[model samples]
Target: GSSGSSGAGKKLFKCNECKKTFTQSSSLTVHQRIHTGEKPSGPSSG
Candidate 1:
Protein backbone atom coordinates (compact mmCIF):
# COMPACT_ATOMS: atom_id res chain seq x y z
CA GLY A 1 0.00 0.00 0.00
CA SER A 2 1.04 3.65 -0.65
CA SER A 3 0.80 6.53 1.76
CA GLY A 4 -2.18 8.85 1.46
CA SER A 5 -1.64 12.23 -0.22
CA SER A 6 -1.86 14.41 2.82
CA GLY A 7 0.01 17.68 2.34
CA ALA A 8 2.09 16.21 -0.46
CA GLY A 9 4.41 18.20 -2.68
CA LYS A 10 4.23 21.31 -0.57
CA LYS A 11 4.91 24.41 -2.64
CA LEU A 12 7.28 26.63 -0.73
CA PHE A 13 8.23 30.06 -1.99
CA LYS A 14 12.01 30.03 -1.65
CA CYS A 15 14.06 33.12 -2.40
CA ASN A 16 17.14 32.42 -4.49
CA GLU A 17 18.66 35.82 -3.80
CA CYS A 18 18.62 35.64 0.00
CA LYS A 19 17.68 32.02 0.63
CA LYS A 20 14.43 32.94 2.33
CA THR A 21 11.10 31.15 2.41
CA PHE A 22 7.49 32.42 2.50
CA THR A 23 4.20 30.60 2.69
CA GLN A 24 2.77 32.73 -0.11
CA SER A 25 4.34 34.04 -3.32
CA SER A 26 2.85 37.50 -2.79
CA SER A 27 5.23 38.11 0.09
CA LEU A 28 8.04 36.32 -1.71
CA THR A 29 7.85 38.65 -4.71
CA VAL A 30 7.79 41.69 -2.45
CA HIS A 31 10.86 40.43 -0.60
CA GLN A 32 12.71 39.61 -3.83
CA ARG A 33 12.04 43.12 -5.21
CA ILE A 34 13.50 44.62 -2.06
CA HIS A 35 16.77 42.77 -2.56
CA THR A 36 16.72 43.41 -6.33
CA GLY A 37 16.33 47.15 -5.61
CA GLU A 38 13.19 47.51 -7.67
CA LYS A 39 11.07 50.66 -7.44
CA PRO A 40 7.46 51.40 -8.27
CA SER A 41 8.59 53.76 -11.05
CA GLY A 42 7.13 56.85 -9.39
CA PRO A 43 8.39 60.09 -7.89
CA SER A 44 8.43 58.85 -4.33
CA SER A 45 12.17 59.13 -3.74
CA GLY A 46 12.19 61.54 -0.80
Candidate 2:
Protein backbone atom coordinates (compact mmCIF):
# COMPACT_ATOMS: atom_id res chain seq x y z
CA GLY A 1 0.00 0.00 0.00
CA SER A 2 1.08 3.60 -0.63
CA SER A 3 1.41 6.18 2.15
CA GLY A 4 -0.05 9.67 2.06
CA SER A 5 2.75 11.19 4.10
CA SER A 6 4.47 14.37 3.02
CA GLY A 7 8.13 15.30 2.95
CA ALA A 8 9.85 17.83 5.20
CA GLY A 9 9.80 21.45 4.09
CA LYS A 10 11.80 24.60 4.88
CA LYS A 11 10.42 27.30 7.16
CA LEU A 12 8.91 30.42 5.60
CA PHE A 13 7.71 33.86 6.64
CA LYS A 14 4.08 34.87 6.39
CA CYS A 15 2.69 38.32 5.67
CA ASN A 16 0.13 39.69 8.07
CA GLU A 17 -1.69 41.99 5.65
CA CYS A 18 -2.10 39.64 2.71
CA LYS A 19 -1.55 36.31 4.40
CA LYS A 20 0.95 35.59 1.61
CA THR A 21 3.99 33.51 2.51
CA PHE A 22 7.62 33.65 1.32
CA THR A 23 10.68 31.48 1.61
CA GLN A 24 12.89 34.33 2.89
CA SER A 25 12.33 36.91 5.60
CA SER A 26 13.79 39.74 3.53
CA SER A 27 11.33 39.07 0.73
CA LEU A 28 8.47 38.98 3.19
CA THR A 29 9.49 42.30 4.76
CA VAL A 30 9.62 43.99 1.38
CA HIS A 31 6.30 42.53 0.34
CA GLN A 32 4.61 43.78 3.49
CA ARG A 33 5.52 47.39 2.66
CA ILE A 34 3.28 47.28 -0.38
CA HIS A 35 0.31 47.59 1.93
CA THR A 36 1.59 51.01 3.02
CA GLY A 37 2.08 52.29 -0.54
CA GLU A 38 5.81 52.57 0.07
CA LYS A 39 8.33 51.67 -2.61
CA PRO A 40 12.04 51.08 -2.61
CA SER A 41 14.02 54.31 -2.67
CA GLY A 42 16.03 55.20 -5.76
CA PRO A 43 19.20 57.28 -6.00
CA SER A 44 17.92 59.39 -8.90
CA SER A 45 14.59 60.24 -7.31
CA GLY A 46 15.70 63.76 -6.40
Candidate 3:
Protein backbone atom coordinates (compact mmCIF):
# COMPACT_ATOMS: atom_id res chain seq x y z
CA GLY A 1 0.00 0.00 0.00
CA SER A 2 1.79 3.15 -1.24
CA SER A 3 0.66 6.74 -1.58
CA GLY A 4 2.28 9.90 -2.81
CA SER A 5 0.18 12.22 -0.61
CA SER A 6 -1.11 14.18 -3.54
CA GLY A 7 -3.64 16.92 -2.99
CA ALA A 8 -7.10 17.21 -4.60
CA GLY A 9 -5.77 19.35 -7.45
CA LYS A 10 -3.27 16.73 -8.56
CA LYS A 11 -4.13 13.73 -10.68
CA LEU A 12 -2.98 10.84 -8.51
CA PHE A 13 -2.14 7.68 -10.36
CA LYS A 14 -4.11 4.89 -8.81
CA CYS A 15 -3.63 1.12 -8.76
CA ASN A 16 -6.48 -1.26 -9.45
CA GLU A 17 -5.43 -4.11 -7.17
CA CYS A 18 -3.74 -2.47 -4.22
CA LYS A 19 -5.70 0.76 -4.45
CA LYS A 20 -2.55 2.75 -3.87
CA THR A 21 -1.94 6.22 -5.23
CA PHE A 22 1.35 7.49 -6.60
CA THR A 23 2.43 10.77 -8.15
CA GLN A 24 5.04 9.24 -10.43
CA SER A 25 3.83 7.11 -13.34
CA SER A 26 6.78 4.77 -13.16
CA SER A 27 6.08 4.03 -9.50
CA LEU A 28 2.53 3.10 -10.35
CA THR A 29 3.63 1.08 -13.36
CA VAL A 30 6.13 -0.86 -11.29
CA HIS A 31 3.58 -1.40 -8.54
CA GLN A 32 1.04 -2.79 -10.98
CA ARG A 33 3.46 -5.60 -11.77
CA ILE A 34 2.54 -7.05 -8.39
CA HIS A 35 -0.94 -7.82 -9.72
CA THR A 36 0.19 -8.27 -13.32
CA GLY A 37 2.83 -10.81 -12.09
CA GLU A 38 6.23 -9.90 -13.53
CA LYS A 39 9.41 -8.13 -12.51
CA PRO A 40 10.93 -5.40 -14.67
CA SER A 41 13.95 -6.70 -16.52
CA GLY A 42 15.79 -6.87 -19.87
CA PRO A 43 17.89 -3.69 -19.67
CA SER A 44 15.14 -1.63 -18.16
CA SER A 45 16.32 1.92 -17.44
CA GLY A 46 20.00 1.01 -17.29
Candidate 4:
Protein backbone atom coordinates (compact mmCIF):
# COMPACT_ATOMS: atom_id res chain seq x y z
CA GLY A 1 0.00 0.00 0.00
CA SER A 2 1.14 3.53 -0.81
CA SER A 3 0.21 6.58 1.19
CA GLY A 4 0.92 10.27 1.52
CA SER A 5 -0.34 13.13 3.66
CA SER A 6 -0.49 16.25 1.56
CA GLY A 7 -2.94 18.94 0.46
CA ALA A 8 -5.82 16.47 0.75
CA GLY A 9 -5.00 15.92 4.40
CA LYS A 10 -4.46 12.18 4.47
CA LYS A 11 -7.09 11.16 1.95
CA LEU A 12 -7.36 7.39 1.68
CA PHE A 13 -8.58 5.03 -1.05
CA LYS A 14 -8.84 1.30 -0.48
CA CYS A 15 -9.28 -1.83 -2.57
CA ASN A 16 -11.89 -4.15 -1.03
CA GLU A 17 -10.28 -7.41 -2.14
CA CYS A 18 -6.70 -6.60 -1.15
CA LYS A 19 -7.47 -4.01 1.52
CA LYS A 20 -4.67 -1.99 0.02
CA THR A 21 -4.83 1.79 0.02
CA PHE A 22 -3.33 4.25 -2.40
CA THR A 23 -2.88 7.98 -2.43
CA GLN A 24 -4.03 8.27 -5.99
CA SER A 25 -7.11 7.12 -7.87
CA SER A 26 -5.02 5.89 -10.79
CA SER A 27 -3.16 3.57 -8.49
CA LEU A 28 -6.40 2.02 -7.29
CA THR A 29 -7.55 1.46 -10.86
CA VAL A 30 -4.44 -0.54 -11.64
CA HIS A 31 -4.57 -2.40 -8.37
CA GLN A 32 -8.16 -3.55 -8.92
CA ARG A 33 -7.07 -5.20 -12.16
CA ILE A 34 -4.80 -7.47 -10.16
CA HIS A 35 -7.81 -9.07 -8.51
CA THR A 36 -9.37 -9.64 -11.93
CA GLY A 37 -6.23 -11.40 -13.20
CA GLU A 38 -5.75 -8.94 -16.02
CA LYS A 39 -2.35 -7.91 -17.38
CA PRO A 40 -1.02 -5.81 -20.19
CA SER A 41 -0.01 -7.81 -23.24
CA GLY A 42 3.67 -8.25 -23.80
CA PRO A 43 5.94 -9.44 -26.53
CA SER A 44 5.30 -12.98 -27.69
CA SER A 45 7.54 -15.71 -26.35
CA GLY A 46 9.71 -17.57 -28.84
Candidate 5:
Protein backbone atom coordinates (compact mmCIF):
# COMPACT_ATOMS: atom_id res chain seq x y z
CA GLY A 1 0.00 0.00 0.00
CA SER A 2 2.22 2.76 -1.26
CA SER A 3 -0.58 5.30 -1.56
CA GLY A 4 1.64 8.19 -0.82
CA SER A 5 2.00 11.18 -3.10
CA SER A 6 3.83 14.13 -1.67
CA GLY A 7 4.77 15.68 -5.02
CA ALA A 8 8.26 16.21 -3.69
CA GLY A 9 9.83 16.47 -7.13
CA LYS A 10 7.62 17.64 -9.97
CA LYS A 11 8.57 20.24 -12.51
CA LEU A 12 5.96 22.68 -13.80
CA PHE A 13 5.73 25.16 -16.68
CA LYS A 14 4.34 28.59 -15.85
CA CYS A 15 3.16 31.44 -18.02
CA ASN A 16 4.41 34.84 -16.84
CA GLU A 17 1.59 36.66 -18.58
CA CYS A 18 -1.26 34.66 -17.01
CA LYS A 19 0.62 33.01 -14.19
CA LYS A 20 -0.69 29.55 -15.03
CA THR A 21 1.34 26.41 -14.39
CA PHE A 22 1.18 23.27 -16.49
CA THR A 23 2.73 19.86 -16.47
CA GLN A 24 3.98 19.93 -20.08
CA SER A 25 5.74 22.60 -22.13
CA SER A 26 3.70 21.66 -25.17
CA SER A 27 0.50 22.63 -23.36
CA LEU A 28 2.16 25.80 -22.21
CA THR A 29 3.29 26.67 -25.72
CA VAL A 30 -0.18 26.09 -27.11
CA HIS A 31 -1.67 28.29 -24.46
CA GLN A 32 0.99 30.89 -25.19
CA ARG A 33 -0.52 31.18 -28.66
CA ILE A 34 -3.37 33.17 -27.11
CA HIS A 35 -1.12 36.01 -25.96
CA THR A 36 1.48 35.57 -28.69
CA GLY A 37 -1.18 35.13 -31.44
CA GLU A 38 0.60 32.20 -33.06
CA LYS A 39 -0.69 29.83 -35.69
CA PRO A 40 -2.76 26.79 -34.87
CA SER A 41 -2.88 23.23 -36.28
CA GLY A 42 0.02 21.54 -38.17
CA PRO A 43 2.86 19.69 -36.49
CA SER A 44 5.20 22.65 -36.01
CA SER A 45 5.46 26.46 -35.86
CA GLY A 46 2.40 27.28 -33.93
Candidate 6:
Protein backbone atom coordinates (compact mmCIF):
# COMPACT_ATOMS: atom_id res chain seq x y z
CA GLY A 1 0.00 0.00 0.00
CA SER A 2 1.43 3.37 -1.07
CA SER A 3 -1.15 5.53 0.64
CA GLY A 4 -0.14 8.91 1.92
CA SER A 5 -1.12 10.49 5.21
CA SER A 6 -3.93 13.03 4.55
CA GLY A 7 -3.66 14.62 7.99
CA ALA A 8 -2.21 18.03 8.79
CA GLY A 9 1.44 18.22 9.79
CA LYS A 10 3.88 20.89 11.12
CA LYS A 11 1.05 23.01 12.49
CA LEU A 12 2.75 22.89 15.87
CA PHE A 13 3.11 24.83 19.10
CA LYS A 14 6.53 26.02 20.28
CA CYS A 15 7.80 27.65 23.44
CA ASN A 16 9.75 30.85 23.00
CA GLU A 17 11.94 30.27 26.06
CA CYS A 18 13.28 26.87 25.02
CA LYS A 19 12.43 26.63 21.28
CA LYS A 20 10.65 23.31 21.87
CA THR A 21 7.78 22.03 19.77
CA PHE A 22 4.69 19.99 20.66
CA THR A 23 2.12 18.18 18.57
CA GLN A 24 -0.82 19.67 20.38
CA SER A 25 -1.75 22.67 22.53
CA SER A 26 -2.34 20.51 25.60
CA SER A 27 1.21 19.24 25.47
CA LEU A 28 2.51 22.75 24.97
CA THR A 29 0.42 24.02 27.86
CA VAL A 30 1.85 21.39 30.20
CA HIS A 31 5.35 22.27 29.14
CA GLN A 32 4.66 25.93 29.67
CA ARG A 33 3.29 25.20 33.15
CA ILE A 34 6.51 23.47 34.07
CA HIS A 35 8.45 26.66 33.39
CA THR A 36 5.81 28.84 35.05
CA GLY A 37 5.32 26.59 38.10
CA GLU A 38 1.60 26.19 37.43
CA LYS A 39 -0.31 23.15 38.70
CA PRO A 40 -2.14 20.70 36.50
CA SER A 41 -4.96 20.18 39.01
CA GLY A 42 -8.28 21.83 38.46
CA PRO A 43 -8.59 25.18 40.18
CA SER A 44 -12.31 24.70 40.77
CA SER A 45 -11.71 21.48 42.67
CA GLY A 46 -9.19 23.05 45.01
lDDT of each: 0.67, 0.63, 0.67, 0.67, 0.68, 0.68
Q: Could you tell me the TM-score of candidate 1?
A: 0.50
What tens digits encode model 2's per-residue C-alpha lDDT throughout 1-46? Answer: 5563752245466655666777788888788767656565544332
Q: What's the lDDT for candidate 5?
A: 0.68
Error of 1 at 34 (Å): 1.0
Compute the lDDT for candidate 3.
Answer: 0.67
Off by over 4 Å in 3: 1-9, 38-46
Our tally of clashes for model 3 stands at 0
Error of 5 at 38 (Å): 8.5
- Candidate 4's C-alpha lDDT? 0.67
Expressed as tens digits, the lDDT of each residue in 1-46 for candidate 1 is: 6675753245677766566777799989888768668556655433
Q: What is the lDDT of residue 34 in candidate 4?
A: 75
TM-score for candidate 3: 0.51
Candidate 5 per-residue lDDT over residues 1-46, each given as its tens digit: 5654964236577776667767889988889878677465444532
10 residues in a row with least lDDT, candidate 4: 37-46
Candidate achieving higher TM-score, 1 or 5: 5
What lDDT score goes with residue 43 in model 1?
52
Model 5 lDDT, residue 39, Cα: 61
Give Cα distance to truth, residue 3, candidate 4, Å: 18
C-alpha TM-score for every candidate: 0.50, 0.47, 0.51, 0.50, 0.52, 0.52
Clashes of each: 0, 0, 0, 0, 0, 0
1 against 3, candidate with superior lDDT: 1
